[PDB]
Design a protein around this ligand. Sequence first.
Ligand SMILES: CN(C)C(=O)c1cc2cnc(Nc3ccc(N4CCNCC4)cn3)nc2n1C1CCCC1
Length: 261
Amino acid sequence: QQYECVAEIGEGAYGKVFKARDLKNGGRFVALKRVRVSTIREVAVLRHLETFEHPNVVRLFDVCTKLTLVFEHVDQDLTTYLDKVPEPGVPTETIKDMMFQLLRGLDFLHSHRVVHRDLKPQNILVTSSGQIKLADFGLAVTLWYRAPEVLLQSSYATPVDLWSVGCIFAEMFRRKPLFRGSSDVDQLGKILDVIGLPGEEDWPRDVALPRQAFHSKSAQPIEKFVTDIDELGKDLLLKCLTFNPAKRISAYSALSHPYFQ
Ligand SMILES: CN(C)C(=O)c1cc2cnc(Nc3ccc(N4CCNCC4)cn3)nc2n1C1CCCC1
């Protein structure tokens, strides 16, 4: 066979992913994923996205006839990069650059009508040369990066990923997740303890959870939780971690933010 499986990547409720030797292409490493039996549509969206070969999205090499997906392989995810970084942590300009690359791939995906929906450091790939690549999106548990509207079961638009990006931004400074909740209700609580209770006008209509189920008074200063963050990074982090997804910054606006002057 064209590929020899060597290891399992992780273990996800999306199916098994293998690290494999690409016997025909110089024995390079590839990430192999099998699909079972709108799905045809998703694969076409993925192949179409690959035509652009955006630098900040994982390369798709092949699609084999039930259906097997061949991607490039990258050694580390953001998790293992933040776990191995020497003290006191990640250089200020390394965080800036990585965040710019994250928003570049995100704006590319959003402008092509793709919502990641499950952005976390575990699916952000960090290349040998320091390139950030978005992976594991566009195909049909940790709530630590889950947006408030997903938690509330109301909307699932592109702002969902900007909340996730804000959580990752903070975690790049802290090297620990900003909101380590254990359930959707807990997660939403841990969030409102930091950002404060939103205006009744910012609370989604016809959701199970009312605003009155929480009493997380005022917004605590974010510098308490994210120590070492500059004033400009604080503006971008607040704009990402905005309650109302309509009021949330977009990936396109974030790319222009003074933080990246
Ligand atoms: C397969 N699909 C659809 C993809 O988009 C895809 C293309 C990929 C290319 N290289 C990796 N590398 C990689 C990523 C995470 C981890 N870790 C796992 C957690 N513990 C630490 C080590 C280890 N190696 N993963 C890829 N993925 C996915 C991203 C999430 C897993 C599979």
